[PDB]
Request: fold
Amino acid sequence: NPYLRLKVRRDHIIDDALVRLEMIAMENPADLKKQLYVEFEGEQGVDEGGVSKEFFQLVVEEIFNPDIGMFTYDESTKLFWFNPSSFETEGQFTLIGIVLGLAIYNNCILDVHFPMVVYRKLMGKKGTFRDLGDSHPVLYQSLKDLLEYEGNVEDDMMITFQISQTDLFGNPMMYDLKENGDKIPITNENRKEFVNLYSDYILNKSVEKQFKAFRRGFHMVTNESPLKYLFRPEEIELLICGSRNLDFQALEETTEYDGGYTRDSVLIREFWEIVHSFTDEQKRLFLQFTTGTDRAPVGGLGKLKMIIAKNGPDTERLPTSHTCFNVLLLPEYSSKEKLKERLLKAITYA
Amino acid sequence: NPYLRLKVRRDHIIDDALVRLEMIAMENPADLKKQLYVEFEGEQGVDEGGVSKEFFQLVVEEIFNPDIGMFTYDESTKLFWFNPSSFETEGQFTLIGIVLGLAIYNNCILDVHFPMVVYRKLMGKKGTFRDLGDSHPVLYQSLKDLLEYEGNVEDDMMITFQISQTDLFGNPMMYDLKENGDKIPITNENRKEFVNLYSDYILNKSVEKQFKAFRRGFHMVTNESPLKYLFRPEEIELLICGSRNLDFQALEETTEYDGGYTRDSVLIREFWEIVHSFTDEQKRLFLQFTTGTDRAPVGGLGKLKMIIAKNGPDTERLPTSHTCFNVLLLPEYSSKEKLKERLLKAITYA
Amino acid sequence: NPYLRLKVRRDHIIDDALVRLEMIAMENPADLKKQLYVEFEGEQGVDEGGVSKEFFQLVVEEIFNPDIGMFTYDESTKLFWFNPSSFETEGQFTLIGIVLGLAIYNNCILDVHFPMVVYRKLMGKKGTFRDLGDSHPVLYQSLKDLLEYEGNVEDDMMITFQISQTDLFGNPMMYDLKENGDKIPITNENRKEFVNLYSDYILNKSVEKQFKAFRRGFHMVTNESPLKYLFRPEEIELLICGSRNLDFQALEETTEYDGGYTRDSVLIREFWEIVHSFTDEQKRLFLQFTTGTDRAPVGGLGKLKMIIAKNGPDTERLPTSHTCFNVLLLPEYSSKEKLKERLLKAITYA
Reply:
């Protein structure tokens, strides 16, 4: 009944994960929406959610890593987008999809960055011209200009229903967006149609396969859930990435201590005095630093169950952390001022 | 055919749009589920939501203008209720119905102010006594007083089940809440029945016509994904009016500049410093001055994609704005102190 | 019949509510799906939500009172758990179950503190080992330590599938987690099963009867309407217990007065200057003093519609309040220093 249970070995997380999830989904599709328990082969210690969280961080890291070539980063927008060229990776997309779902069912928030269109497509919708704004700003401006051109296309701008599709070392791939997209020039009359097709390409046709497998994954989990009724894509984004809540009161509550600290410690009582006087940008930095993100789960920061463990006597070492357990490793410094200097330099340098 | 597309001309908005949306119902009524694209006739410009937003603003403005007689404004609650008298308007209601629908699939929040009962009736519920508290303060007090009277009603009040519905000229038309209200005095025992019948008429019967229309319209652009998963009337009010989130950081992000401003600029930085140090009260006056409201869209303020453009050298002119584009025309003043002075006076003067 | 309507006399709330609800349940049970209208006998006075609120406070208070012995309190977590030995109380559990349900539709929050496991069980999900962590902190640690032990369970912890269950005055109750738990020693191979079964019994089998009644009561008010499909139980908790918003601006708007105090009054304006400064730790206390909790309903503090009534001329008493209506009886002090000094002592003394 309850209990999902995934046993995967680091080194093969993705393969192992996938394989198990495909069987479970085959046996009881519902088991995919239950309380997740991850276990790394050969490593003991009950998963209180921290393991499952590391499981998520790890999968997310491999997938968006350029190495595997599944997504492309936009230095500009700071968002990934499927790489149309990803080949023989149906399984990984199926997995990153499953994981996004599992992440929604366990109050776990991933640090993923897709353009609104990825969620919009996950809502069964087609990417359109307006959607081009976030995914491909550059391209969108051109189509915008072309659209808003006052002169006479054709004789001015000589373009057809053919478009380029390069690969790493150039080599465009003159794709026809329409039957004979060679001799059908773009006119102040085609442009409208040209743009909507150029847009349907890029956002949809261009990336099916990769995206088809991606949704299949998200759907093995989100099938039959309040997701079918969500309105805007931001709602799915909130479910996956978290809100921008900022309690800290509540975060202070539910904050446990290990290594001999306890709620009453000059170092702890000082920590909070400091943290609360923090500016929000600083509070969000601390969060990134101690957790995988700067956002909050469903219920707020208090649901993060942070742990401030001692990490040596006074020193100069910067406080470190384990973002999968939300554990702040804090060396018991001699002064509030030192704690403050050392904490700020630690989270701003991250 | 991406987009819904509404080609309408100012100086004939409500009609035209009603005529298109209607016809869009006479054919593949699916389109209503798509992404709205408004186009004012004559005017050339790609709708990136700014034209659409204006469509909404202008519409909402007329529909609630006393002139068109569809709604009445409660000077005190600053809310609007349906007008039992507006007949021959059973299409203009079906219109805001659509507009409210559309506004939910667009993260464009409206400037609609309905007493909770409207949303309650939309979720499919009957209006009751308690609802009068906001929709009819004064009426509610009278009925609350009737029920709470400690003396002997009948031996103290000359009222029966025949209540009046009065003109705009002082002419009353008797209306019987029950079989033969003329006789049949209200007693300490009927008063409840009386209050319940007087409330049912006024919140349900008296405006069945205009509401049903409003319901249909809302129903035309959202069907199937009802307010299922929305348990409180308040949840629907947010979808249409935004939350009271006030992120600002994030609003600072996503903010673009124009006319030579850029993220770096003494003025632009003095602005943020100022805006950030703004009391929440002020912060709300500014969203209202720059956007059509003090509320926030799904996803926080950052989704406003606000724009701040330079508007000539240090003047005395107070800044200005095009709410439908979230653009803040800011004169390149000669000082951070002058910016704050002119800005505040401008946001408080609107 | 607009409302549910529970006419009950104090001194007999649990009993009267139960009888009336048992009648409403028999006759058109529909009433169970209408907004609650409470009437304390012999106390004429429209229930504007105030009465309902008091009714909840009294019911929750009585039901979670150590006297009736239905729930047990954990002083570490400050949470309540079902008492497995709460024998002839099947009707009370239903009542408190019916309350939580109404809470879901009332923008009035119940200050009920349950381990997240309760709300998962309400969604028809069985509790799990991880779930204990909150309901049974110490038992959990044991089982965890049991599972993490690197030694040799048997010749180290000598234990079996027979656990010990006590009653008010010691005297365990050797419950067999398995067939003849007597002679099946827990080993490094059993413990997983031992721990599952132990976690199962406790959260599920152990409270079966009492929780079944509880769930039923909840179910009576929340039929079909998903709540069963929500992604996270915390979503059910929020609806019932409120979030942690702290608008105050907004709480200042919507705030009404009585007994002379008009929106404008040096004493009134002096009030907002004090509160608006304050610390959001004091602001949490103040909120706890005037209303039940420091949490806000759907929408924010503004929804609380707090009332500031003048409680006689300048005295030396501490301002007082009726939490059921979020009413702060404020004596018209001789300055804000009095005001500010009196209030601060009140909220930190009540």
Notes: The longest strand of chain A covers residues 307-310.
